[PDB]
Design a protein around this nucleic acid. Sequence first.
DNA 1: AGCCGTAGGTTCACCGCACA
DNA 2: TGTGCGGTGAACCTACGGCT
Lengths: 481, 483, 189, 189
Amino acid sequence: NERNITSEMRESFLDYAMSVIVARALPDVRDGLKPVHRRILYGLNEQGMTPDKSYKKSARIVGDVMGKYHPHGDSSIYEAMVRMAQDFSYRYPLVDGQGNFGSMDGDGAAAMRFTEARMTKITLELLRDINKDTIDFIDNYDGNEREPSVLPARFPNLLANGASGIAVGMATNIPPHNLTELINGVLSLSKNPDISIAELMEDIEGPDFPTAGLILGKSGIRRAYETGRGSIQMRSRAVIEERGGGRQRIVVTEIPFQVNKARMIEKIAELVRDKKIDGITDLRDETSLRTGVRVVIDVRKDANASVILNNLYKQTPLQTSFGVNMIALVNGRPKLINLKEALVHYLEHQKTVVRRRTQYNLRKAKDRAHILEGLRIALDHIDEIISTIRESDTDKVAMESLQQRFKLSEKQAQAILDMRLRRLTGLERDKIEAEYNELLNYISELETILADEEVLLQLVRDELTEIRDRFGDDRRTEIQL
Amino acid sequence: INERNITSEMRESFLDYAMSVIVARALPDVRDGLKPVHRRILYGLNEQGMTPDKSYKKSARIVGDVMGKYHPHGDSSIYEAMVRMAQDFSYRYPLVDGQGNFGSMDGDGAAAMRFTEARMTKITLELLRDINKDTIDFIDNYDGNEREPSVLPARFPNLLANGASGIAVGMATNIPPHNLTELINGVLSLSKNPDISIAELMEDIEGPDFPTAGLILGKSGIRRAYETGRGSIQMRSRAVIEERGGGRQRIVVTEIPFQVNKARMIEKIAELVRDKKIDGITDLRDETSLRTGVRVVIDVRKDANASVILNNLYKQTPLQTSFGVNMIALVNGRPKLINLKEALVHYLEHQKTVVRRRTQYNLRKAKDRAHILEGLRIALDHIDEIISTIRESDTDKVAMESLQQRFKLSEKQAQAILDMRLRRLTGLERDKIEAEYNELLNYISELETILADEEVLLQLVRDELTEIRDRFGDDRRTEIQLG
Amino acid sequence: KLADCSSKSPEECEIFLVEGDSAGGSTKSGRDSRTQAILPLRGKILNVEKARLDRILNNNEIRQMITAFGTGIGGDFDLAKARYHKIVIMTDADVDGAHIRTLLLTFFYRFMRPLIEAGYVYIAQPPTGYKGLGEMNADQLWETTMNPEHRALLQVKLEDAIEADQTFEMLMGDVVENRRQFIEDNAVY
Amino acid sequence: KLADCSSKSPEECEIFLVEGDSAGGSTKSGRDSRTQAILPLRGKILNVEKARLDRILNNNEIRQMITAFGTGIGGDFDLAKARYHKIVIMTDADVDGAHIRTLLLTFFYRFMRPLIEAGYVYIAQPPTGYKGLGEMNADQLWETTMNPEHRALLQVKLEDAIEADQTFEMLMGDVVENRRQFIEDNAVY
DNA sequence: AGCCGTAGGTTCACCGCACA
DNA sequence: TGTGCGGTGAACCTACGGCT
Ligand SMILES: O=c1ccc2ccc(F)c3c2n1C[C@H]3CN1CCC(NCc2cc3c(nn2)OCCO3)CC1
Ligand SMILES: [Mn+2]
Ligand SMILES: [Mn+2]
């Protein structure tokens, strides 16, 4: 009935601090997701909103996620889903959206009633075999549902899409990467547990932003990869060209990651008006859906456009630094990780997922084989099978007689009873046999995988290699010396 | 398509908007007493099995399924509409069961949909009863991906029971709520006398019955409304004069008029005292509690006549407000001003149609079932022959054809035999089938009997109406004082 | 709130009027920012036929339209000062969008009548099957409704002033009976 | 914004602080309006340990609380002018509710410290398993949390003034590292 | 007058951390 | 000083008829 103010402060604030750290702002090292992002993807998976199906309503998606898994504001859920659909925020979008989904100018997405969404083809790789006992499920916030604790994640999502998060007492800032480079890096690690950062960097050259652009030098990247912290200087793609007659202009076609284009432009205009920068006679955003990003900066006749550009880098977000701070949840706890640690935890997560899948496929195959052996016995002595059932007054007595006479299990006897008459036709009888033989080979194939750790690891390699070829793409961000 | 005359554009855009509002938004249908928004809500609750015996379901999920499948409009319109149906001060017979903050008489809005949960009320099951027995016409939805009902079976006279108020284009509607016991009795007398008059109906339906109780002054306004569909009814709060100590008195209000915001009424009373447009009032408190109930206290000055102050309060504040009855409802998809009888007539005809279409449906379903059972009897009596015929057949098509010609069976009969599981061959199934078939023949006869005689059908509607009455009928809440 | 275009030559410039940001978003992303300006409003706009001048001049959306066009109103209306030669009404393809179009035309007729007479007011024809413009992808909106090579724009014409004056009175005016009579005599269910 | 009570005797009056109108509704319907006042806020409040003096006095929610208590702040504080002998913090039963409590406690300790010393500040205890008070029925909120007969109010007591100054500075102050260290030392997973 | 209730629309307070 | 992103929270236009 009495509460000490010092204790109340320490307990309540810790309660909040911990919750934001482990269940809100920080991503898991295994799937690179936050709880809201994982809940949105899972919602799309359970509702079967696959890329082959048509676009589903954002309202229903958000409404289901909120009620079943995410006990928070609908605006937070919707905004997180929208961000996953933006090709300027996500190096490898996770949500395929229809309608107004926002712009590089900071414009928000249309109200959720108007927009529609589904998974992208790559998101299927995050969810692959999630129902084959690969990952651990947990109780939802109210004990009425079940949710995944982490995703199979068949591609290194944490490093591919990166992440930004402000928590309590810490924050996170991981940049996106090229998928082809990451997978190659992972392949090297699997062949060499003692590989160095320097060697891993032969595969992974540095960050790769969806908005392309340039990176200056390899020192910042190296520092970040080695320690988990480092400053990386980003720069816009800019060229100087003539526009007649004797006059020049600066043309920008790529801007730094996370920079608002409209905001950047106003900042330039502000400096021109305040006379803090000399030589600019006109500023136009010629960006078009059809022509791409194009920001034009007219230069005064005879003024040096190269000097003006260098000045814009110093005073406007035309050059912005990305401060790497790689904090992720490892074994549930926040931790500062380096490139190798991140790759190690992801590789180890891939081994467990493939082993658990194999063990699941095995159990189910054996259970089906057992049921097929029951039906095969039934087909061989179908006459006897009928007589046993015909002379039985109840199902319970029929069961017991079938088990007794044909030395069947309880499951086998039930299957025979559930069998429809149509199963007796020529083609149907041949299907039961055909399935059984295929299943025996399959069982054998799966046992070969579990009996050898190297074969398992090779399968992980082959499956990662398959995704690299299908979803792997070219580098967008140029890294200059 | 180069040009467009401004006048032509205005007429054709405007009539389009107006027509939509009139027939698909603001006006209720005379058959089920619902506007599309509410019908779509109740239907959504039924499709997901959100029945009274089930747990409450999240409001956000409800709104989201309804918005996506049936109602392509803002989420607020849907939510707030569901919220109203859950309030005991808005609906004489609530249609929705709510858990969480669902508003107040003081004008407070419901809590955000993420916090609330809802489900169907027991009485709502009666609106949806027999919806899956071909009683009502279904139509395609706004995009063509779903199906929705044009009207609900409405096993109780919902339009008059809960009433409605809507503002459309070119017209509006204002139908007060009524007592269910009274309504059903009226419907009964009408089914026994097509020539029954308004004055005779009023022997059953004494007048409106508000969820907020209170009083009504006179019968002239009520009579006019029932006779023509238009009339001004004077609603009055329930107020008493009692002693508070030391020779001082107070006015105590325990019931207020329908659709009147309590906090807003109180503020207007405080305004009159502050502006000195009324004298004798020393204090104004709102003592309303869950335990106490509605209780507004108005302290009178010592020796001042409290009855005079009350009278003035009625004239000067919403403590006495009038309900302007304007009974416009959709009759065959057109707006129409109707009286009390015409409303009961169209409702009774809807009930006669529903129950008939129900009996016709059960009859088809039964004949189909008897037909299948005949095919199963032949199969079990000659099971060995049936089994060899299937085994010797390579495909399903071949088996079906062999069964049809060898055993004199229809396509459906043959299919049901193929779908039949082996456990259906047990020793007691042959007798179990014979029993069901016999029962069905008797049942088919009972259904044909009803459809061959219009009086047995009408009487059946009466029994089912009477059954609703006894189970859901309650006491009158609003007292009608004369005059 | 106005999202203007680059050019300042009103003959080739045009301004699109949309219901809000959800529609404005797809519009801004699919437009040609060189000659196409965008003004997102706030849903249902005031019916000038039922409102008095003080009420009209103080409504935010009315003020922005006046400011954006640069023509002034009533007797001060100067056509030579227009910033766009194409004022395009592009409301959503639903019955409420049709109603906002009537509310806009009402305003243009009572305060910017010469603007219509010059053929400066147009009507976009977005495809049906969408609750709002926000539901469409930027390219789909551009190719079917905004691109001058493929789009079909409806130019508003004034034939008979007397009949137009009566039509605006009957439908948008305060007398409900006339409006009820029109509905009855023309409604086809 | 303040929904005050009937009685004007502070000795028996109390004021419940809730997160908003969603929670406020269940609160207003379930209380005793004779002695129970209710002031709904708008979520996370300004952190006074990080914000400047002028910003705090200009903050809309901060002013409403001071006006509600009627005691003034800092040097102009007067306990005899207290409108309620019980200031009850009743945030939602979630992590974000616990955080808002600390924010309010921080506010009461830096500007109305004597209010905590006099035993006027209380912490309500709503049932767990509810995302907010708006999710509860009026009656169940009253019986479990607000009913003097059955509620378990926790009285805030100040023990050590030195340890308290160091706690508020550590948890709510502008220095991140001290707060990170506290988490590392006290975290249990 | 506003207010009854289905409709179209949207804006701005706060926390938390690390970077220029 | 202001911004990136998941969180707590809420308001006020309008049409319509009737009465680093
Ligand atoms: O309080 C305020 C105060 C001011 C203000 C200003 C501008 C402004 F935009 C808004 C303001 N607000 C609130 C906000 C307006 N709200 C209305 C309702 C709208 N609903 C979203 C939604 C929820 C769903 C759902 N679908 N859609 O289905 C799934 C579960 O829940 C969300 C925006
Ligand atoms: Mn619209
Ligand atoms: Mn809360």
